[PDB]
Amino acid sequence: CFPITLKFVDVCYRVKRTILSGVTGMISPGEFMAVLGPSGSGKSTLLNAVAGRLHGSNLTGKILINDGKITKQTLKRTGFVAQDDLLYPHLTVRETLVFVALLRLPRSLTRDVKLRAAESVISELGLTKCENTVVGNTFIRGISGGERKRVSIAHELLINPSLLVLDEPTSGLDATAALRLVQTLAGLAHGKGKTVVTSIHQPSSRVFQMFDTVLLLSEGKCLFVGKGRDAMAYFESVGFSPAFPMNPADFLLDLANGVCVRQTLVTAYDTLLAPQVKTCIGITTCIATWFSQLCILLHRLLKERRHESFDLLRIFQVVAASILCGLMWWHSDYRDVHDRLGLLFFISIFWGVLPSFNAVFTFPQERAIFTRERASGMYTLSSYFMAHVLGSLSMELVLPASFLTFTYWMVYLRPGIVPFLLTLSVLLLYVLASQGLGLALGAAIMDAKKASTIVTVTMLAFVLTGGYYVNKVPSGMVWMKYVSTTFYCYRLLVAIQYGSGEEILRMLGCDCRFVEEEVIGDVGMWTSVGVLFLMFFGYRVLAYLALRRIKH
Amino acid sequence: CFPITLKFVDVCYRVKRTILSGVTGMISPGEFMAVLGPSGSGKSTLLNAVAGRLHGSNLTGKILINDGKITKQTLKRTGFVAQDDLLYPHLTVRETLVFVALLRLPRSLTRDVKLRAAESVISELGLTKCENTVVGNTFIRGISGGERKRVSIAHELLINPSLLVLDEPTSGLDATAALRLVQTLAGLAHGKGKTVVTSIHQPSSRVFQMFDTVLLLSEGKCLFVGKGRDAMAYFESVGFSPAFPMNPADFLLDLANGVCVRQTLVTAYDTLLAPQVKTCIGITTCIATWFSQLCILLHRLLKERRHESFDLLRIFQVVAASILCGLMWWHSDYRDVHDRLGLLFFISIFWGVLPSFNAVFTFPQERAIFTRERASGMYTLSSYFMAHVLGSLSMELVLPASFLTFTYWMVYLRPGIVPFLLTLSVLLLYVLASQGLGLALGAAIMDAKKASTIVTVTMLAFVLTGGYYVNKVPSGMVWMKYVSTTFYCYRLLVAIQYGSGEEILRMLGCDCRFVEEEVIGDVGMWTSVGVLFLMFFGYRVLAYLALRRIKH
Numbered sequence A, B: 001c002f003p004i005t006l007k008f009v010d011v012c013y014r015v016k017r018t019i020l021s022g023v024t025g026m027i028s029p030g031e032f033m034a035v036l037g038p039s040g041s042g043k044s045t046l047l048n049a050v051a052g053r054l055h056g057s058n059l060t061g062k063i064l065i066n067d068g069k070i071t072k073q074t075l076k077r078t079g080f081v082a083q084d085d086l087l088y089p090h091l092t093v094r095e096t097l098v099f100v101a102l103l104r105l106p107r108s109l110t111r112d113v114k115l116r117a118a119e120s121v122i123s124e125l126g127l128t129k130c131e132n133t134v135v136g137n138t139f140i141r142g143i144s145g146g147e148r149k150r151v152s153i154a155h156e157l158l159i160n161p162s163l164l165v166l167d168e169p170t171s172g173l174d175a176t177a178a179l180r181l182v183q184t185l186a187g188l189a190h191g192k193g194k195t196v197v198t199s200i201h202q203p204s205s206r207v208f209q210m211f212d213t214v215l216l217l218s219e220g221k222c223l224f225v226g227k228g229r230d231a232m233a234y235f236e237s238v239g240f241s242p243a244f245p246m247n248p249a250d251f252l253l254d255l256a257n258g259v260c261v262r263q264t265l266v267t268a269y270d271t272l273l274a275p276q277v278k279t280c281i282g283i284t285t286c287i288a289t290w291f292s293q294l295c296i297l298l299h300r301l302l303k304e305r306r307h308e309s310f311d312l313l314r315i316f317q318v319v320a321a322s323i324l325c326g327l328m329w330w331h332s333d334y335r336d337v338h339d340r341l342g343l344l345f346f347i348s349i350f351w352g353v354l355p356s357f358n359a360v361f362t363f364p365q366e367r368a369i370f371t372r373e374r375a376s377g378m379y380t381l382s383s384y385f386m387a388h389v390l391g392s393l394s395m396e397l398v399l400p401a402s403f404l405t406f407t408y409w410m411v412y413l414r415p416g417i418v419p420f421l422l423t424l425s426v427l428l429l430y431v432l433a434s435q436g437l438g439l440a441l442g443a444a445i446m447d448a449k450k451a452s453t454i455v456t457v458t459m460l461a462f463v464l465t466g467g468y469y470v471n472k473v474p475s476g477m478v479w480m481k482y483v484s485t486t487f488y489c490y491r492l493l494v495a496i497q498y499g500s501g502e503e504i505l506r507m508l509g510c511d512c513r514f515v516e517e518e519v520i521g522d523v524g525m526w527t528s529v530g531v532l533f534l535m536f537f538g539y540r541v542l543a544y545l546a547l548r549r550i551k552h
Ligand SMILES: CC(C)CCC[C@@H](C)[C@H]1CC[C@H]2[C@@H]3CC=C4C[C@@H](OC(=O)CCC(=O)O)CC[C@]4(C)[C@H]3CC[C@]12C
Pocket: A313, A314, A346, A349, A350, A353, A354, A357, B349, B353, B452, B456, B459, B460, B463, B464, B469
């Protein structure tokens, strides 16, 4: 049993405005202190300066975890439940808390110890009768808002903390769900010997009955500390009583808001209670934990990258483009050299626009969950990036491989096993090379509407210079095809279906320079392959360096 | 002065579950009655059955506006402020309330009477110090959440009602903004002689002090009616007192929730208070108001259809496609008959995909505001549809007319005034004909993600059968080009730049059937024009019949 006594002595916090000034108190092992105050009084700045997420020059004052300063050994026993709940919406409640248990608990334990620690906090917080329910956010409909907060508390109870610092847990709940939530926070402060500190926004009449001690901030100058049942007995002494039946938490916020008065209760506290508050004061251990962090992060996000890959409005978009492409070029003749190349350029526009546009929403949408979880240990951005690289290498190759299996034998392309699997290999390498353009642009620009416009303009300049629409490019724009991804896929597709124009010039008898300039071209088959590999790796190295630059 | 005495006698409401059963009471002229209860108790069903938005077979009971039944003459003096605020986010507070004043007040008045009635409710509700601030929703940042509710109350105060029925106005506010809001609802019930009925979710200690009468529902059986200051004096008689200092609104909801008990207070009310509650119980007048409803609705939504037309991420998407199209075909030669026709088919793909995709979000996003305002009189869906037709005829023609003015003289298209204005006329007629495909699809499918997929699949089958990519269409798919919008714009552009292939076959000397099949084609210039007009009108008649079918 390691309990924490906590004492902050005269904490100040300016920002460039004074938010906190002279806040002093103590929090004991085994008490449930609630921090009351109006909005903009400095409640949430006091919780961040106590949990340890704020230190520097803007802060001023001694914050003492068990008579000593805050070192990083204490932060493993200190939890902070922030105001917003960032959970993946397709995992169940048991799946959410088991993946967090493997990632957060140390690797000295077995996989059965770290699995029984995740089904103990399910029974502690009362999540047993929803443990197979999907979490959901607003569209993947799941657990309630009062059980979404209990999952976010269970993230911080898996490491068994001694000081649990919550930041407005009862905001947005009922009067019943917000009473039962405080009934459990009072449970694991009187039975577990913990030290719970919270900040309630507007307590009801019997939520306020459950507080051991109350700290009341006016606009950053600490009107009252002490017990909750002795709150209005102190204000009767200075001469402030309610004139009608009030909730005692309503009467306190009306003193801190100027409706009853602020300066008269600063000088009353500073001479009567603020005096005596001072009186009680390797290559198999560096590598194996990366490949286990990767293996859990890849198995966790399989369900996330399954509804953003096999969306039923994206399967329909590829089923429709297979039937249309399969009907317009149905039983096509390879001696029509102009329509066979417009088929192979439709495959290059469709499978460069569709992967690069969908990949640009991947990193903006997970910036908040990655920031909260990387700062909490739990991974190191290179096992997070390499689980998004590998997790979308596997899922994004099922729809282009089913487009081509359908529309290769109906369209009468080049018959055989080796012409089929060379066309399939070039199409899958082009989907992965163009997907990384969307990853590198969505990570450099962490907005998703500002980056869907730059990947639209880039894919339009890639298609216009890709080899088919314009044949007489002006002399100052012939360089732009060499940076184009579409130019190297389309030159490879024509080289598989036609070769070096030898059989087609015999059958056409044109050996009329139409088929010498469109089927042979400029780049070889190995220069075209080795630039689609340089754009595979190179557009994912640029997406990693973009994500280092954010700080998150 | 026309005041309303309101008495509901034994209102029941089943749904196929009993929501209301035996609710009886009276509301007097000049009292501010608040309706209390837990969530799911039938508060919001009682307000809709009293304002008049619920009547039929599911309802049972006599609802009497001033000793008589509810006729539609009384509903002009009855206002209902619903729970969610549906305001256009680019109008200022004065602009919002003046357009509502012209549309709601009768046409007997002048434009200065209906303008001074809109600056009287600004001063009444205390909106004078934000009357030039933009409203905004979350992105167009504007007035606060406590002033967004005061605009929604001012919509219903413009018709000068006698019974104002609000539905949870203080939800999502502060403790200060939700006290000042009740201080004005108590202002226009004690000074104006109105009859305000509201339903507060969780009142604070001094919000409850401002209620004249209180109606308390348990789960639909009316625990208490009477004064608010005599609420707990009645429950002391049956033997229910708080054991600790409570907010008196908290003690009442704990009686109605089973935490203190429900059936013991139904039989206490039914024999002590529910007895004695029975004891007090043309062609220039049909046309001119349409063309004035159209003229206000078109001037109101000019600012709405200015940020969805001149979005700065859409100006950049057309500026980039002008420079790319202007550089790849820079000083192009018209004897390159294959590259001149790929320029004229990129203009047909770009200006059919871009208007039809943006038009599909127009009607889904305004379904909630149109439903609330059409049911409230104020317009009739044919002056609303013809203000969206005409309001986007004007704004959507500025970006295609600036694309073409830039890239006609750099690209060296056909020189002259008559070749320029025939190419501009065909391009503007094609933008309006393809925009109506997005309007007809977004109105038949009132989702915006399910309809952006069907307008993607349709525009892909329009571009493949459009005439350039495939020449030898199989015999069962040649009909599909005649329903294509892209086929008729592209056949008109080639007919303006080349004519009936006479000068180009002389200069090429091929009179080699390449230029006989791609520049002359199938349809004439008048059949192509008169089908783009049939798709202009016909895709907007189908969008009107889709909007009748919704009921909204
Ligand atoms: C037939 C020849 C001339 C090729 C012409 C280009 C086509 C391949 C274009 C025409 C319309 C394009 C579509 C128009 C709109 C979009 C934007 C974007 O689609 C969405 O917004 C839906 C994505 C989602 O949210 O699921 C992704 C690409 C897509 C489907 C485009 C894919 C490529 C398409 C089919």
